[PDB]
Structure 1
Amino acid sequence: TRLKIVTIHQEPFVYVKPTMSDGTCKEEFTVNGDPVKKVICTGPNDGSPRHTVPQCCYGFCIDLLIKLARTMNFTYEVHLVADGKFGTQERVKKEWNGMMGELLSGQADMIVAPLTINNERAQYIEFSKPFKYQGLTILVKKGTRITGINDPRLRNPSDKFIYATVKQSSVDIYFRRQVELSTMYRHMEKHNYESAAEAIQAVRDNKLHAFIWDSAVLEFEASQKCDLVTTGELFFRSGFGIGMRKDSPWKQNVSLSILKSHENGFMEDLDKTWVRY
């Protein structure tokens, strides 16, 4: 009766590292003196044969899982999503992939990861109240001033100020969907990068002036300190929630425990541990 937890590699929520030679996880420490709590999470390493191996998982969402498990008295085992995706609906009877598909098929009983709460997913699964707010922001070289999604250099684009996101990413899809972002979308389309890592160096390399991406990740990328920086107000806000099936008996208590944790400062401690730089 161990709950099967599915997660995904997404820093700083979930770090995934190889085990040491004896198969244990390296003992490490947080920014405050605290020991980093690590769990073994099995999953693929790298077309590919998807050979499953014990790996070390830690971070915001792992700390949360450990708290939840304690609080609600459940045991668990953690694995990484086999296809490496959060989850979208696709066809060829439409079917969810990623963590969404694993939860619905029974391969997982709970999704503990920065899983964006949205209408399409909520039609199928239950989200907890948010354990963390979600939004987009902008990544630029230090010294650049962008106000947010309503800045004239974004609203009225030219090749003098090039902005983009990752091709076919969740952000790209979101932008294509809004007719009011059309003019903004045609500019991005011509400049979108293949991966976040390829977008970010481009910002370092003055090849791309602004990268639009998840806010938590961008502050983290910026935390290197500091040829890069984040600018403006967050936009297109939502939240990250624990995902469960509609008939889960744990769902109300998971949500209540998350509210309790926001209210007593536990979540701020996590913010200080993993997302405050």
Structure 2
Amino acid sequence: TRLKIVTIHQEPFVYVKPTMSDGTCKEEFTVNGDPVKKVICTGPNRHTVPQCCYGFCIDLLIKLARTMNFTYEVHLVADGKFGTQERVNNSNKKEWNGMMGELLSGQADMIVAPLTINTERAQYIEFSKPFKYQGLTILVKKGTRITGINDPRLRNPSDKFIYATVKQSSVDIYFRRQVELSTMYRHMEKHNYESAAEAIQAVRDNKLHAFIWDSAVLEFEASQKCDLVTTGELFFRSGFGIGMRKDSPWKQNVSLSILKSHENGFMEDLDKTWVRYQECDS
């Protein structure tokens, strides 16, 4: 009877850590001194095992479950991707990968993660109203001089300045579905990473010069690591929403909960707990 919730590792929305030797999760406290709420999330470490999950989206999940009175089980997307539609098995048959695919196949009943709301996905699933308003920006090593998405080193691609995004993500599609961005798309196609964490590390290690990704994630990362910065103003706006199959019995109630959370300070408090609370030190 409990909902199968699928999520993905993506700080500060979802942290994923090993359980202690006894199988439980380490007792930690937020910046406010409150216990950090932790849930067991099974997924690849390959090898699939129980792990500890917490963060902005986990607090949101707990709030939704309480408000809507439902039980759940959380697992991390098996292929580690957000989701794009592609031909499979060397055929012309198209299927969605990532969390999108799991939701459509029934492996998941609800996607609770920093999932971007876009038109392509909305053609196959239903989204709640946005639980977070953000956009796209660019992450670079402090010192790198880039104006933004219109910088010549991005518009006139060269092996001297490498940039990329994450494979099978909404950002990949944003560029793929725009002829005006064909040159850029062709460049990133040869450099895209499997996960945001790896791309961010690459920028830090000087192996990737620019990482194009969600501003909610990049601004947090850049604000916690003083060697990393973002290019400032977002070049596109998008929201994160809860994902459900079309004609789901949870759609209306999920959006009602999100509305209330935007109205009473709950969402704002999540930002003060998980996003803006301290200076760089990582």
TM-score interval, smaller chain = 0.7 to 0.9
- The alignment partner of 1:180 has SS state of helix
Q: Residue by residue, what CA displacement relative to the aligned partner does 1:109-132 show, whole Å, maximum 9, x if unpaired?
A: 111111111122211111000111
1:58 aligns with 54
Q: TM-score, normalised by structure 2?
A: 0.84
Q: Residue by residue, what CA displacement relative to the aligned partner does 1:186-221 show, whole Å, maximum 9, x if unpaired?
A: 565676667645544554455654332221222232
Question: Does the 8 Å CA contact 1:147/1:233 hold for their aligned counterparts?
Answer: no
Question: Does the 8 Å CA contact 2:5/2:109 hold for their aligned counterparts?
Answer: yes
How far 1:267 sits from its partner (Å)?
A: 0.5
Give the direction of change, closer, same or farther, for the CA distance of 1:240–1:156 in structure 2 (3 Å limit): same
Question: Does the 8 Å CA contact 1:116/1:134 hold for their aligned counterparts?
Answer: no
Range 91-100 or range 167-176, more displaced: 167-176
Structure 2 distance, partners of 1:90, 1:29, is: 42
Give the direction of change, closer, same or farther, for the CA distance of 1:266–1:101 in structure 2 (3 Å limit): same
Question: Does the 8 Å CA contact 1:203/1:210 hold for their aligned counterparts?
Answer: yes
Question: Does the 8 Å CA contact 1:139/1:218 hold for their aligned counterparts?
Answer: yes
How far 1:137 sits from its partner (Å)?
A: 0.9
How far 1:37 sits from its partner (Å)?
A: 0.2
Structure 2 distance, partners of 1:186, 1:150, is: 16
Give the direction of change, closer, same or farther, for the CA distance of 1:161–1:51 in structure 2 (3 Å limit): closer
Give the direction of change, closer, same or farther, for the CA distance of 1:23–1:96 in structure 2 (3 Å limit): same
Question: Does the 8 Å CA contact 2:82/2:170 hold for their aligned counterparts?
Answer: no
How far 1:223 sits from its partner (Å)?
A: 3.0
- The alignment partner of 2:49 has SS state of strand
- The alignment partner of 2:233 has SS state of strand
Give the direction of change, closer, same or farther, for the CA distance of 1:56–1:119 in structure 2 (3 Å limit): same
Question: Does the 8 Å CA contact 1:157/1:187 hold for their aligned counterparts?
Answer: yes
How far 1:96 sits from its partner (Å)?
A: 2.1
- The alignment partner of 1:126 has SS state of strand
Structure 2 distance, partners of 1:187, 1:181, is: 10
Give the direction of change, closer, same or farther, for the CA distance of 1:52–1:11 in structure 2 (3 Å limit): same
Question: Does the 8 Å CA contact 2:40/2:51 hold for their aligned counterparts?
Answer: yes
Question: Does the 8 Å CA contact 1:137/1:230 hold for their aligned counterparts?
Answer: yes
1:159 aligns with 159
Give the direction of change, closer, same or farther, for the CA distance of 1:210–1:180 in structure 2 (3 Å limit): same
Question: Does the 8 Å CA contact 1:115/1:242 hold for their aligned counterparts?
Answer: yes
How far 1:161 sits from its partner (Å)?
A: 6.1
Note if 1:208 corresponds to 2:204: no
Give the direction of change, closer, same or farther, for the CA distance of 1:3–1:191 in structure 2 (3 Å limit): closer
Structure 2 distance, partners of 1:3, 1:264, is: 26
Give the direction of change, closer, same or farther, for the CA distance of 1:98–1:139 in structure 2 (3 Å limit): closer
Question: Does the 8 Å CA contact 1:2/1:77 hold for their aligned counterparts?
Answer: yes
- The alignment partner of 2:5 has SS state of strand
How far 1:26 sits from its partner (Å)?
A: 0.4
5+ long unaligned stretches in structure 2: 278-282
Range 87-96 or range 236-245, more displaced: 87-96
Q: CA RMSD in A?
A: 2.7
Give the direction of change, closer, same or farther, for the CA distance of 1:124–1:132 in structure 2 (3 Å limit): same
In the comparison of the two structures, how many residue pairs are matched? 273
Give the direction of change, closer, same or farther, for the CA distance of 1:204–1:103 in structure 2 (3 Å limit): closer
Structure 1 distance, partners of 2:264, 2:48, is: 38
- The alignment partner of 2:239 has SS state of strand
Question: Does the 8 Å CA contact 1:112/1:243 hold for their aligned counterparts?
Answer: yes
Give the direction of change, closer, same or farther, for the CA distance of 1:17–1:68 in structure 2 (3 Å limit): same
Give the direction of change, closer, same or farther, for the CA distance of 1:106–1:136 in structure 2 (3 Å limit): same
5+ long unaligned stretches in structure 1: none
Sequence identity (%): 100
Give the direction of change, closer, same or farther, for the CA distance of 1:61–1:167 in structure 2 (3 Å limit): closer
